[PDB]
């Protein structure tokens, strides 16, 4: 029941189009998810990436989620902005035992480098609206 | 006998055309309800949404009602529109109703759908919210 | 480091105003307190009573907690806590288990201690339970707080 | 030159606040060390307890360290340290602390004694109490938490 999740999200503008990438790995198998949004922010995409990666896991699992998100790192290491997404994250984490790993970039983290690539590509041709922005 | 109800009400002005959307989810089954009014308010549609969602239940049930209404939250976590408050009390009476005041529509897919219904109904109002008292 | 804790929770509606009472008795020492909530449930007050009673402990202790809560009795005599965590706190239907906020708080409050529950079958022979019940019911008639997690 | 160290650590949640307790006794004199952390795990606190107990020594010494940690026992009996990538090329887990333990042990001749429980090990029961007390008032961040 050991699943790994690698997520990354970013916006090309501030605000501007954005996207997220999420990679799930279990027993040597991998699934990838990405989505682009027309108008959002760096913070919202970093949070959305983690939310969606977790939601992709249908059954309760022990999770190790790696992300280089400074927004999430600070939030977990220390009205509230983006409360809609924070609530969605708490709800997405609910069925699982999630251990967060806030990494230092992509050096030594190939899956995260790849999640970043998925996010950027999705941000280049976005169609979905970030309804909570 | 557990039922989930997702409600949302809104208005384009104060007053202005408005509408509500209510989605009921039972074991598998799903029912939706929506209606638009020529001249009403956000508060009144938020209340009407919960009322109609609950009135749709044909037998006693344990209910988890999810809504983002600040109007309702303040009232239940602690007169204008007496006709509707009266109707809400009567609509809740037969049931064990647990309100859930959500912070946003993300992670609350049904609430986003309910909002869509309410907004769509407001663009085509055919009913009179006589009570707009 | 032995402490006896007597707790009780009740509500006047489902949901409705409710309250809890907790009494802690250490060697000679005694602490009591209570609080009422405007909108809550019997189950939530029963759980809150145990939670607050335990939270009043300032250092690790060996605890005997006396309550007539059927909610806690079923959960602990059947080990629902471990059963729930194993299933990601979802019901047989896939929906979230109710009152997880309070169950989590209870687990946290019990963690530093060695807790032994005594699910009493009455208030006789345990005057403190009669007093805790009195406190909880009086608090239900005088709500001053919001049960946020509800 | 012989010193006895008794360590224990625990977390009140997974993750949750936690703490460690380490007791050092030499020919009688006794020193104790404890600290609480805001968010950590039981495994991490059991490891941190041994680390800090050893770091409490000021000079090379012969050490008999007693702990009921299943996490440490398994790691040492199966030669995990000597054996940093899992069988399936996955990051170890708490490698930051394993590295810390290796460094803390370096100056000393450490003999581990993995005990079953508290029964017959009063110093370990006291270390457990220290750890639990520290976890009730956590103020430190367990940064490596993984």
From Swiss-Prot, chain A:
Residues noted as binding Mg(2+) 1 in the record, renumbered to the chain: 8
Sum up the protein's function in the record's words. Endonuclease that specifically degrades the RNA of RNA-DNA hybrids. RNase H participates in DNA replication; it helps to specify the origin of genomic replication by suppressing initiation at origins other than the oriC locus; along with the 5'-3' exonuclease of pol1, it removes RNA primers from the Okazaki fragments of lagging strand synthesis; and it defines the origin of replication for ColE1-type plasmids by specific cleavage of an RNA preprimer. Involved in production of retron derived msDNA (a branched RNA linked by a 2',5'-phosphodiester bond to a single-stranded DNA).
> What results from gene inactivation?
In a strain that encodes a retron, the msDNA is abnormally sized.
Q: Which organism is it from?
A: Escherichia coli (strain K12)
Instruction: Report residues binding Mg(2+) 2.
Output: 8, 116
Q: Which Gene3D superfamilies match?
A: Ribonuclease H-like superfamily/Ribonuclease H (3.30.420.10)
Q: Which domain of life is it from?
A: Bacteria
A matching Pfam family: RNase_H
Similarity comment: Belongs to the RNase H family.
Tell where it localizes: Cytoplasm
Matching InterPro entries, A to Z? RNase_H, RNaseH-like_sf, RNaseH_domain, RNaseH_sf, RNaseHI
Name-wise, this protein is Ribonuclease HI
Fill in the subunit field for this protein: Monomer.
**Phenotype for residue 116 to H/N:** Slight decrease of activity
Swiss-Prot record, chain D:
Species per Swiss-Prot/TrEMBL record: Thermus thermophilus (strain ATCC 27634 / DSM 579 / HB8)
What is the protein's quaternary organization? Answer: Monomer.
Q: Which family does it belong to?
A: Belongs to the RNase H family.
Query: What name appears for this protein in its UniProt entry?
Result: Ribonuclease H
Name the domain of life this protein comes from. Bacteria
Report the function annotation for this chain. Endonuclease that specifically degrades the RNA of RNA-DNA hybrids.
Q: Where does Mg(2+) 1 bind?
A: 46, 68
The taxonomy runs: Bacteria, Thermotogati, Deinococcota, Deinococci, Thermales
């Amino acid at each position: 029941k050991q699943v790994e999740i690698f997520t990354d999200g970013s916006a090309l503008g501030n605000p501007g189009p954005g996207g997220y990438g999420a990679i799930l790995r279990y027993r040597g198998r991998e699934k990838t998810f990405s989505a682009g949004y027309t108008r959002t922010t760096n913070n919202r995409m970093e949070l959305k990436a983690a939310i969606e990666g977790l939601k992709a896991l249908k059954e309760p699992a022990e999770v190790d989620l790696y992300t280089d998100s400074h927004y999430l790192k600070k939030a977990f290491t220390e009205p509230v902005k983006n409360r809609d997404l924070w609530e969605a994250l708490l709800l997405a984490m609910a069925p699982h035992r999630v251990r967060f790993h806030f990494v230092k970039g992509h050096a030594g983290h190939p899956e995260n480098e790849r999640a970043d690539e998925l996010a950027r590509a999705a941000a280049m041709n976005p169609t979905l609206e970030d309804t909570g922005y």
